[PDB]
Design an enzyme around this catalytic site. Structure first.
Site, PDB file in Angstrom:
ATOM      1  N   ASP A 125       5.634  51.746 -15.618  1.00 48.07           N
ATOM      2  CA  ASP A 125       4.859  50.578 -16.050  1.00 48.07           C
ATOM      3  C   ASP A 125       5.761  49.349 -15.835  1.00 48.07           C
ATOM      4  O   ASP A 125       6.388  48.872 -16.795  1.00 48.07           O
ATOM      5  CB  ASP A 125       4.464  50.764 -17.533  1.00 48.07           C
ATOM      6  CG  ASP A 125       3.780  49.534 -18.166  1.00 48.07           C
ATOM      7  OD1 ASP A 125       4.186  48.379 -17.864  1.00 48.07           O
ATOM      8  OD2 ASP A 125       2.861  49.723 -19.025  1.00 48.07           O
ATOM      9  N   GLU A 163       1.321  40.646 -16.473  1.00 52.10           N
ATOM     10  CA  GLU A 163       0.338  41.675 -16.768  1.00 52.10           C
ATOM     11  C   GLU A 163       0.090  41.653 -18.259  1.00 52.10           C
ATOM     12  O   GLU A 163      -1.042  41.738 -18.701  1.00 52.10           O
ATOM     13  CB  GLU A 163       0.845  43.054 -16.344  1.00 52.10           C
ATOM     14  CG  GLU A 163      -0.234  44.091 -16.057  1.00 52.10           C
ATOM     15  CD  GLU A 163      -0.864  44.651 -17.292  1.00 52.10           C
ATOM     16  OE1 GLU A 163      -0.516  45.759 -17.713  1.00 52.10           O
ATOM     17  OE2 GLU A 163      -1.719  43.984 -17.861  1.00 52.10           O
ATOM     18  N   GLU A 164       1.156  41.502 -19.033  1.00 54.51           N
ATOM     19  CA  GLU A 164       1.100  41.838 -20.449  1.00 54.51           C
ATOM     20  C   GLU A 164       1.076  40.624 -21.381  1.00 54.51           C
ATOM     21  O   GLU A 164       1.398  39.509 -20.962  1.00 54.51           O
ATOM     22  CB  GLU A 164       2.227  42.810 -20.794  1.00 54.51           C
ATOM     23  CG  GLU A 164       2.609  43.748 -19.647  1.00 54.51           C
ATOM     24  CD  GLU A 164       2.730  45.188 -20.087  1.00 54.51           C
ATOM     25  OE1 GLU A 164       2.066  45.562 -21.080  1.00 54.51           O
ATOM     26  OE2 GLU A 164       3.457  45.962 -19.424  1.00 54.51           O
ATOM     27  N   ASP A 210      -1.066  51.087 -11.717  1.00 59.97           N
ATOM     28  CA  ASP A 210      -0.189  51.008 -12.902  1.00 59.97           C
ATOM     29  C   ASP A 210       0.184  52.406 -13.493  1.00 59.97           C
ATOM     30  O   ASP A 210      -0.252  53.464 -13.011  1.00 59.97           O
ATOM     31  CB  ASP A 210      -0.781  50.060 -13.974  1.00 59.97           C
ATOM     32  CG  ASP A 210       0.283  49.173 -14.676  1.00 59.97           C
ATOM     33  OD1 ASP A 210       1.383  48.948 -14.126  1.00 59.97           O
ATOM     34  OD2 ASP A 210      -0.001  48.657 -15.775  1.00 59.97           O
ATOM     35  N   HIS A 292       5.692  52.398 -23.001  1.00 55.18           N
ATOM     36  CA  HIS A 292       6.145  51.316 -23.883  1.00 55.18           C
ATOM     37  C   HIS A 292       7.225  51.731 -24.847  1.00 55.18           C
ATOM     38  O   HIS A 292       7.969  50.862 -25.347  1.00 55.18           O
ATOM     39  CB  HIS A 292       4.993  50.707 -24.681  1.00 55.18           C
ATOM     40  CG  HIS A 292       4.229  49.636 -23.953  1.00 55.18           C
ATOM     41  ND1 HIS A 292       3.326  48.810 -24.589  1.00 55.18           N
ATOM     42  CD2 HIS A 292       4.218  49.260 -22.653  1.00 55.18           C
ATOM     43  CE1 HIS A 292       2.788  47.981 -23.718  1.00 55.18           C
ATOM     44  NE2 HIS A 292       3.312  48.229 -22.536  1.00 55.18           N
TER      45      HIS A 292
HETATM   46 ZN   LIG Z   1       2.679  48.066 -20.086  1.00 56.33          ZN
END
Ligand SMILES: [Zn+2]
Ligand SMILES: *[C@@H]1O[C@H](CO)[C@@H](O[C@@H]2O[C@H](CO)[C@@H](O)[C@H](O)[C@H]2NC(C)=O)[C@H](O)[C@H]1NC(C)=O
Length: 323
Positions: A125, A163-164, A210, A292
């Site tokens: 990721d 992205e986040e 992803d 994560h």
């Molecule tokens: Zn992520």
């Protein structure tokens, strides 16, 4: 005019002879060590990192003998901490050509607060994506160069930055790049200037990648729109392990498998898809079992995968483009 031809396309299947030559024309230890690792660092926005990377790419491309035309879309936004900058990357073979196969990872990391020497990285990721996307125009270089004559149709890469969400995933704390690309794609027309034809008309497919790098993944198929194509990965993935161009892999655990229909996953892709673009979303589901956690690293990777999975589309990508 074209704009509607996009939805007639079907591919050129090659043969073993060829199918051999570039299941061997790829080295995932070459990827590991030139493309990938030197991104394994903290690369979300603002950060010294979000440059060592960006920049890293640029030449990673252009150094290549093929034909790329490279653009940095950069802008200023609303971060739940103020006004940070953002930097979308836009690789392009044949810009004047006016319908494109495009692949596109997110090139950034997650911000994660700093309470010890340990620090996020995001393997799966998602530098793994970008890293193949990098393999993917190395391995098949000159094949890609072999097209300057110059219908209109080629290869766009895209690396979304942001992205986040910083603190808290939201409709407006996330995707920054993505969205900002759409109404910028949308605004501007090519041909320059064919009236009711902007940049979002020539986007042929979009294969966003992803969460890629775990052992033993599974990719749904979300949009029948594009599943006729998903069928290609049904297809590739077998005319292929049969001939054994496949390591540590069996077809009684397929990942390109068909049932998870019309489903609620929200990447960088949504706002493209929401000018009706056909998009293809590919993304270990369920999530790598470490997503994560600080543990989203090298350690829990697996060559095999990446690779096998690196070939595969280095066919599809062809196929599409009548090689
Ligand atoms: Zn992520
Ligand atoms: C595999 O496919 C290719 C065609 O795409 C065959 O080889 C090519 O054949 C023609 C000769 O006119 C040209 O497209 C190329 O010069 C050939 N070369 C290469 C390197 O692809 C090949 O024979 C086919 N293999 C089979 C049928 O087993």
């Amino acid at each position: 005019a074209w704009t509607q031809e996009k939805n007639h396309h079907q591919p050129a299947h090659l043969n073993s002879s060829s199918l051999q030559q570039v299941a061997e024309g790829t080295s995932i230890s070459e990827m590991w060590q030139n493309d990938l690792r030197p991104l394994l660092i903290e690369r979300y926005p603002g950060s010294p990192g979000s440059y060592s990377a960006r920049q890293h790419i640029m030449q990673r491309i252009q150094r290549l003998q093929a034909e790329w035309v490279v653009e940095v879309d950069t802008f200023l936004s609303r971060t739940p901490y103020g006004y940070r900058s953002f930097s979308n990357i836009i690789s392009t073979l044949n810009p004047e050509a006016k319908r494109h196969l495009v692949l596109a990872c997110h090139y950034d990391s997650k911000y994660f607060p700093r309470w010890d020497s340990r620090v996020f990285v995001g393997a799966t990721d998602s530098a793994v994506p970008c890293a193949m996307m990098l393999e993917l125009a190395r391995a098949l270089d000159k094949k890609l160069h072999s097209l300057k004559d110059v219908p209109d149709l080629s290869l766009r890469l895209i690396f979304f930055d942001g992205e986040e969400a910083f603190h808290h995933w939201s409709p407006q704390d996330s995707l920054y790049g993505s969205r900002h690309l759409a109404q910028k794609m949308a605004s501007s027309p090519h041909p320059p200037g064919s009236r009711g034809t902007n940049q979002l008309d020539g986007m042929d497919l979009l294969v966003l990648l992803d969460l890629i790098g775990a052992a033993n993944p599974t990719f749904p198929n979300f949009f029948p729109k594009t599943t006729r194509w998903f069928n290609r990965l049904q297809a590739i993935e077998k005319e292929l392990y049969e001939l054994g161009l496949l390591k540590d892999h069996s077809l009684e655990r397929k990942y390109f498998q068909n049932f998870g229909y019309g489903n609620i996953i929200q990447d960088d892709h949504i706002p493209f898809l929401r000018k009706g673009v056909p998009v293809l979303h590919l993304i270990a589901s369920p999530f790598p079992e470490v997503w994560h956690t600080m543990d989203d690293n090298e350690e829990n990777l697996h060559a095999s995968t990446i690779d096998n999975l690196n070939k595969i589309i280095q066919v599809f990508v062809l196929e599409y483009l009548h090689l």
